[PDB]
Structure 1
Amino acid sequence: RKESYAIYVYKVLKQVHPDTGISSKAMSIMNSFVNDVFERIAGEASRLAHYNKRSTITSREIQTAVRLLLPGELAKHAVSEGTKAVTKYTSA
């Protein structure tokens, strides 16, 4: 097997645009972008938890990470959505 973010990006695209498709090259580019953002946020949260002498990566660490990396509006909406997701995860 070989794991990838292809089907998830495809589902998001079909949920935002039901007509327009996506090619293999664009899918690989999107997967690389997702991996880059993931590793950026992970390293940010890791060094943030290290600066506070902590050892548990929690929602606050990822929130600070996205507030530091994503500039301006891209931050705000994101964290809002994030909070929303968190709240929904507390619902079930």
Structure 2
Amino acid sequence: TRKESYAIYVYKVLKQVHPDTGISSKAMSIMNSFVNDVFERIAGEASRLAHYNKRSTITSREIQTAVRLLLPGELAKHAVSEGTKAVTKYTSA
């Protein structure tokens, strides 16, 4: 049985922000439950937005509006900025 997690990814991002700082296993578990939490939130709001507008497909627009609903203020603005840049670079190349 292989149970996957986000551990190595939070580790990589941590080494990007603070290359000299490590993280304990418990804090890694907290980060994992955080990523799963926020993921389920944005996915749920995307499902609601897709159901109310009568569409069967989740696109980047529904995820964008869901981010603008969940994240207050600057988290929403910078989050939509980073995500839009990521989809931009993704489909451009």
TM-score of the superposition, structure 2-length normalised? 0.97
Deviation at 1:2, TM superposition (A): 1.1
Kindly tell me the number of residue pairs found equivalent between the two proteins: 92
Deviation at 1:9, TM superposition (A): 0.2
Q: Deviations over 1:3-39 (max 9, x none)?
A: 0000000000001101010000000000000000000
Aligned-residue Cα RMSD (Å) equals: 0.5
- Secondary structure at 1:47's aligned position in 2? helix
Question: Percent identity at matched positions?
Answer: 100
Paired with 2:92 and 2:48, the residues of 1 have a C-alpha distance of 30
Where do 4+ consecutive residues of structure 1 move more than 4 Å? none
Deviation at 1:82, TM superposition (A): 0.6
- Secondary structure at 2:68's aligned position in 1? helix
**Structure 2: runs of 5 or more not aligned:** none
Deviation at 1:49, TM superposition (A): 0.4
Q: Deviations over 1:18-68 (max 9, x none)?
A: 101000000000000000000000000000000000000000000000000
Paired with 2:71 and 2:90, the residues of 1 have a C-alpha distance of 23
**Structure 1: runs of 5 or more not aligned:** none
Paired with 2:54 and 2:91, the residues of 1 have a C-alpha distance of 27
- Secondary structure at 1:53's aligned position in 2? coil
TM-score of the superposition, structure 1-length normalised? 0.98
- Secondary structure at 1:9's aligned position in 2? helix
Paired with 1:88 and 1:31, the residues of 2 have a C-alpha distance of 27
Deviation at 1:91, TM superposition (A): 1.8
